[PDB]
Write a protein that binds this ligand. Structure first.
Ligand SMILES: Cc1cccc(C)c1OCC(=O)N[C@@H](Cc1cccc(Br)c1)[C@H](O)C[C@H](CC(C)C)S(=O)(=O)c1ccc(F)cc1
Ligand SMILES: [Cl-]
Ligand SMILES: [Cl-]
Ligand SMILES: [Cl-]
Lengths: 99, 99
């Protein structure tokens, strides 16, 4: 697809068998989702945004689809204002910025 | 150009005669720069997200050059940790997400 930016680039993702809405965010190094259950062990991580740093849970090698494109990678979970797809998965699905 | 997302998409901008580095951020609704002077009227605004909110000054109808592409739009000024080019100006230079 080709996605313009006159509105938020919100897409449907699938993780854990469930459909969720998420923002394609080239401003984000990593992917962070609202509180949810994921399998396995997690590791601690700090991420910094406009107001400061938050603590999140880091889960590795998690299956996730983005607009139907299947990916496998690191997913962070924590008190994010919105589900964010960051560059770690955007790169996996072959996303680039063009003008 | 086509900009890869293997790395943060930082680009050179020109504003108020100054050259600065800024992040092309599809996740940001608006453009926000570190503390600087700009011409004209302004109004206070709060913007927020991970780590909370910050107070900014909103200036409208500000000319900016992004990778040599001229645009006009609202610029927010305040204690952001990084300069951010948001969708309000990305649209004007014709920037799209593609995969
Ligand atoms: C999710 C994530 C994981 C690891 C590392 C990073 C940087 C990251 O993204 C965090 C995030 O908050 N990114 C911002 C842009 C940003 C902000 C601070 C530092 C860096 Br570096 C990058 C996200 O792309 C844009 C945000 C919004 C997002 C949380 C929906 S925002 O900055 O809060 C914003 C709000 C309103 C505006 F008008 C403009 C910008
Ligand atoms: Cl912890
Ligand atoms: Cl990953
Ligand atoms: Cl604008």
């Amino acid at each position: 697809p080709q996605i313009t930016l006159w509105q938020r680039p919100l897409v449907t993702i699938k993780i854990g068998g469930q459909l969720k809405e998420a923002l394609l965010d080239t401003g984000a190094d990593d992917t962070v989702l609202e509180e949810m259950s994921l399998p396995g062990r997690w590791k601690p991580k700090m991420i910094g945004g406009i107001g400061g740093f938050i603590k999140v849970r880091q889960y590795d090698q998690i299956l996730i689809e983005i607009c139907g494109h299947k990916a496998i990678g690191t997913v962070l979970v924590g008190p994010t204002p919105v589900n964010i797809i960051g560059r770690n998965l955007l790169t996996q699905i072959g996303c680039t910025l063009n003008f």
